[PDB]
Paper text:
The [name] trifunctional enzyme (MtTFE) is an α2β2 tetrameric enzyme in which the α-chain harbors the 2E-enoyl-CoA hydratase (ECH) and 3S-hydroxyacyl-CoA dehydrogenase (HAD) active sites, and the β-chain provides the 3-ketoacyl-CoA thiolase (KAT) active site. Linear, medium-chain and long-chain 2E-enoyl-CoA molecules are the preferred substrates of MtTFE. Mtb is capable of switching its metabolic preference during the latent stage of infection in order to utilize host-derived fatty acids as a source of carbon rather than glucose or glycerol. The Mtb genome encodes an unusually large set of enzymes of the β-oxidation cycle; however, only a single trifunctional enzyme (MtTFE) that catalyzes three of the last four reactions in the β-oxidation cycle is present in Mtb, in contrast to other bacteria such as Escherichia coli, which has two TFEs. Here, 226 fragments were screened in a crystallographic fragment-binding study of MtTFE crystals, resulting in the structures of 16 MtTFE–fragment complexes.
A similar mode of binding is observed for fragment B-[name], which interacts with these two catalytic glutamates using its hydroxyl group. Furthermore, near the CoA-C(ECH/HAD) site, fragments B-[name] and M-72 bind at subsite I1, which perfectly bridges the gap between the bound CoA at the ECH active site and the CoA-C(ECH/HAD) binding site. The distances from the ECH and HAD active sites to the I2 site are approximately 21 and 12 Å, respectively, and the corresponding distance from the KAT active site is approximately 44 Å, when considering the distances between the bridging pyrophosphate O atoms of the CoA molecules bound at these sites. The path is identified by the fragments B-E1, B-[name], M-1, M-49, M-53 and M-72, in addition to the CoA-C(ECH/HAD) molecule.
Residue numbers in the entry:
A (entry chain A): -13 to -6, 0 to 720
B (entry chain D): 1 to 224, 228 to 403
C (entry chain C): 2 to 224, 232 to 403
Amino acid sequence: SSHHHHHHSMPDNTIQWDKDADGIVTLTMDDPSGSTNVMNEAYIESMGKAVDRLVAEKDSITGVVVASAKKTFFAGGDVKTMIQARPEDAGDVFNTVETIKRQLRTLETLGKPVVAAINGAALGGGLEIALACHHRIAADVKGSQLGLPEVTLGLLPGGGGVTRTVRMFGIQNAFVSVLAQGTRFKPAKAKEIGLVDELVATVEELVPAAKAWIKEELKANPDGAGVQPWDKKGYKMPGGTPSSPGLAAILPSFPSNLRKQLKGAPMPAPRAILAAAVEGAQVDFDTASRIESRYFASLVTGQVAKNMMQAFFFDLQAINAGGSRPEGIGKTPIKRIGVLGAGMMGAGIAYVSAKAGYEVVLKDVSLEAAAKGKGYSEKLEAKALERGRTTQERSDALLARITPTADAADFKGVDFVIEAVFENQELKHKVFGEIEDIVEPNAILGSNTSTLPITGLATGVKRQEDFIGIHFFSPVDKMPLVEIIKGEKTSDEALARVFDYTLAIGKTPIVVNDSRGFFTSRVIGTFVNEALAMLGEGVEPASIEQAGSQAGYPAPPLQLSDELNLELMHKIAVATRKGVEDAGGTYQPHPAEAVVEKMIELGRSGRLKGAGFYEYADGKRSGLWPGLRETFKSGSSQPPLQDMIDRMLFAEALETQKCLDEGVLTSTADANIGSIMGIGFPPWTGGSAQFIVGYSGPAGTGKAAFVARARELAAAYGDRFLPPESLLS
Amino acid sequence: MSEEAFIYEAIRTPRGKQKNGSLHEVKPLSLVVGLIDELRKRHPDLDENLISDVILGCVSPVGDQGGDIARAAVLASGMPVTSGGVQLNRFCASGLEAVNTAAQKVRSGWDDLVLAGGVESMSRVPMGSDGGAMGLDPATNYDVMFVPQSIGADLIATIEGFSREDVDAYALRSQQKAAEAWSGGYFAKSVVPVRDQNGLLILDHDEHMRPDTTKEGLAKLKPALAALGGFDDVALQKYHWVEKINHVHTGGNSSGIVDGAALVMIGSAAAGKLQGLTPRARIVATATSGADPVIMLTGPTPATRKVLDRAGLTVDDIDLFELNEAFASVVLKFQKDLNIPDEKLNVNGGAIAMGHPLGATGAMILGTMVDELERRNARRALITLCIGGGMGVATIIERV
Amino acid sequence: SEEAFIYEAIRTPRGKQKNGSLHEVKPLSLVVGLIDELRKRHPDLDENLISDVILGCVSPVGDQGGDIARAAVLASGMPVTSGGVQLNRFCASGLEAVNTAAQKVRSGWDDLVLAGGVESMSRVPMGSDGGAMGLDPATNYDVMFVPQSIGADLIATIEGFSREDVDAYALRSQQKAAEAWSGGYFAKSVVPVRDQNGLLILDHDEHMRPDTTKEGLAKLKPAGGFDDVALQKYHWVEKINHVHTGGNSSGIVDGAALVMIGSAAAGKLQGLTPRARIVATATSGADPVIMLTGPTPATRKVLDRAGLTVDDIDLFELNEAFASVVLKFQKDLNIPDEKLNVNGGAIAMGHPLGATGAMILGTMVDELERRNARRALITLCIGGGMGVATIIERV
Ligand SMILES: Oc1ccc(/C=C/c2cc(O)cc(O)c2)cc1
Ligand SMILES: Oc1ccc(/C=C/c2cc(O)cc(O)c2)cc1
């Protein structure tokens, strides 16, 4: 009933009040605790006082304008509080969002027009505040975004975002376009879909245009002023209600289509958003709003939300704030970049380097190949012209900064080298020797390497202080991680220069110490080897792929092994066996190595050869190889699917704990984001390190339950699942 | 577990097709009242006050089939108002569950003479008109892994190894045996032609039958709610060892969408002797079980095996097997698992040729076996129907 | 042959129609919550032995369509062999499910059966499914369709029940229902409804107006030409005295109920204690223009079938659809006043159609054990001229 948190020192005040001579109240949100208005305890009390005052002075008020004094309008909430919400705190969480929506609902049913003056970003609770208004005006300014992206953190729009968007667009359009993926929209895109009604060139026109809309609405439509479409007698939900014959014919396919998109992964947020949407569309607006609160409380008190809030909020903040960057280093921009090699990696590094505004030289062995390296950018620009993302004026500037060549003299005047020819040490030593002198004197000498140690590669150049590993991922235009590998001779200044270069091209960096396999390749190796071991043990290939998909991976493991080429995996096993039998120890071969060699003997080494675990025709996977079941007697071993799923997740999680023990990684933020954005570790886990402390199974939850399940897998599948002493008491 | 239940009458209407059907203009209540009037014509001196209940199966009890269509049948047909009237929905085997419940009510000794059957006018009330939790509850739909019938049948044919030619071979087999049964006059006295309020003929045959069906014409049909994506992925997320689902089922090897109704008069020996009724068959045993709800259609196998064990019989003791022809792969799997002799399985064709009036099919194929046990002078027959959600229902009858 | 026993009988609280606490709760969730309570009381119950789940539902459309009994079996994770069937016999669907479950156990072809009903009238109002008797002019014009409320007013007119007489019974139902709640009679059977987080939604029958007074009942007003239609058959009556209001008629509420019924060997195999024994069941009726008259010939039918009379019954539980129906029933069989609906009825707590039969059935199971009494007769006036009756015996 009350607009406040409690019925029985007090919080701050974040809303300024102003009533003009016309009776228009302008609520200007300006939280003095930070540079962004968030939905915390201070806002709830502030809006509670203001909404009370709107009702008390309702005789002398003709309209309301909700504005902001920050660079953004209103973005997000209090993650430090939501990540602490225990299951026993479901009552407080439920009551908080019910209070938040009780305020907006009174603001919405005031009998007076309410206009939102969106000056900048309106994300999460911010857009929900605007959705409670009757008219939304956005300033078409750079960097502004509007959306409900709480699903990306494992939450749902619990401040009316689910209920109102469904009231505006119907179940199907609100879920698919706005809610299910938390899509962000530029102000121009927002007006097109219906999230925003008007646009203005600058932010100074917002409050004037808002009060102008109030005056015209009061005179033109005096009856329906301050009345939402779903509060009129003859409201008709777009696309129909769940009882409409047209929608009831496609409604049973919505959960199956979502279960198809998620591949059976245990991500509960999209499942809850769909339930709250459909259940909400069956009842009145207030009953729908309360159902929205209960599904929100079930997510915040859950574990997946804490995994995602830890990874995509806290862990991402620490990385982007220079957590792994050396503390006291200055910044030095780079003029031109030199990409050695025009393969799928070299051509990819050329595109992302130019799209950020950097001149690039693309040197290859022959000019015939260097041209088709720049064609990787042409085919991605033509795909951006027909789809209409970039204009013609902008596209010409991108391809112009790429100068494809085969001459080694064009690297004259390059202060950033990114080699990517092939995984061969004597080749890189020769390639770097041909270029280390023509380039600048203080140039960064980076190398896109997957396994060869950077310290060894540095013995082929002169200035090793500026030699470093800069590991990209294919395709470079999509993969957001850059694995910065710190060689033994690399200086702290080189780390920062590559660190800031990673942020300049719009990617997320991690700092990794030199070690065989680094972090991404070494951990993802345990993932594919666990599946190959399962195949050799006689497990159905279709179950192995389904196990990888239902675990949350973006690509099934046997499919990934074909794209990584089994010859390279055999090559790595020979190198690993070489560093053990020479150091004086006996090599313990992984059980997957027997399956790699068998596929090599059968001439099916991967997608490169045209035949692997899958068959290929017309340059596309044509299905699983029929002879695969006969080769390994598939079906003779039928372990439960959860045992297959856990064997992959635990192999990567345990291997990540080893990397944190050996010093390969210096923070769990690098372990989580690096595993998620680098090798595609499932986001619902929050990272390969978060997966340990946030594990949840039938035995229990937490690190103690992770060890118990690891020992359960070790006693039934091999000693490789035994947890290190770092996780034991 | 004392009073024996006996079948005294078992009739049905002809099954009118969905598109341009002859029964589309007939309210489903009229289909039942017509059968009630036929029972009066055959037994004019039957004291209808001894009828204690009328149980009708109906899968879509909405619109013309809402408001307890069994009660509407009792009131509209002028039956004694003390004759009850109840609608039950157990999906596909609602027609046989109504018969089984009537038989069990007689066995308990607390009901004496019961009308049982079903009604389903799918041309007027399409399947799904009643809605359902699975559908309007994405939380339930997402958890139970809901999969339509047609996908579960394709999955059965994929696992068991039934080719597209195998299912079309059975589809032709059903059309041939259904045509031979009509030409032989087998259905002459049990299929009651539907007439209007003036006595003019509306339908006197199962107009869904394509008796000139050929193997070549069945191969040209293309495989068929299920068109909406996701259901293949949802099915293979549970049956993860299966890589691809071979969609072999078309409109020519699947049960036909038709309208129809059926009535079965069930009562004790004392009730039949008091009304001068000759017992036709005896309800030996009934059973109810099921199987996985993502494959759905499988499930008759535990029901058949339990009703055989309950009656102390084996497969060899049964003379006729009547399984609803929802999909060809379901019958082929049922025949393969139990080693059913081909000359004893659906000897007069099935739903592929004559149609599947959901709520009425169970009583239609039951009365079909009562007539065929007499015409052959055979002893026992077993009737079973698959159900969505995996919950089969089986029944054994014995000629008397 | 086999005797059927009642091992458990629970129900949800009945949430009112306007601003109801259960309006946000899907009727499927109401049944699942009761299934989970049965698991809580018998966690080692072999659910594979449960052969069927029979739910009564008068408006099986929307949230209640698609065989809601089957949906409860799947959503609650019960074995898929446990069946699931919806049945509709108007106001008796709750008790018909229990009776059918008992008859399936007696026949020996079912061992352990769940029975009950569910009706979320705030989400699915009655009549949402349509029907022929209403939406078919040919059969409507013939059977003389009259709403059940007018039949109740006609009963009060013929039997001489005044507006004060029906309101006197309404106050009596409110008093006894409030006395039963405060006395803790419903403590074990009424299972509070909670959300997916465990937060409370409803733990009591909120339709009850315990501070009811006879003066307040008199201030109520009595709630298409159906009066002329009814008198065309009951031609000796000149005018119908409309005495029924919202205070002396059954409340429109949401609720669900479950009853576990099985053979003596079934309970002994699963470590269950029989609470009561189903003694006999019966079904009959009378004129459907007055509708709610089936209980009287059905009660005599179940008394003769069990070899009993009125003096052999300790408790009479008739559903309080309308006050005149209970008064008409009380006068006919000369029911002692202290034996009839001793814990209040639907006038106070509500009438969730498809579930009411199982609710008042479990209500008598508790009151027989609380009083250490022997027998009880339960009957509901079915709509459309039918009646069910059941006699239970305490064990
Ligand atoms: O990779 C990422 C994934 C998710 C996010 C979260 C974005 C976000 C921002 C808000 O103002 C509110 C909110 O609820 C969510 C950020 C990065
Ligand atoms: O879109 C939205 C996303 C999240 C929220 C929740 C905010 C919140 C703020 C608190 O101080 C406590 C709490 O438990 C929750 C509101 C809207």
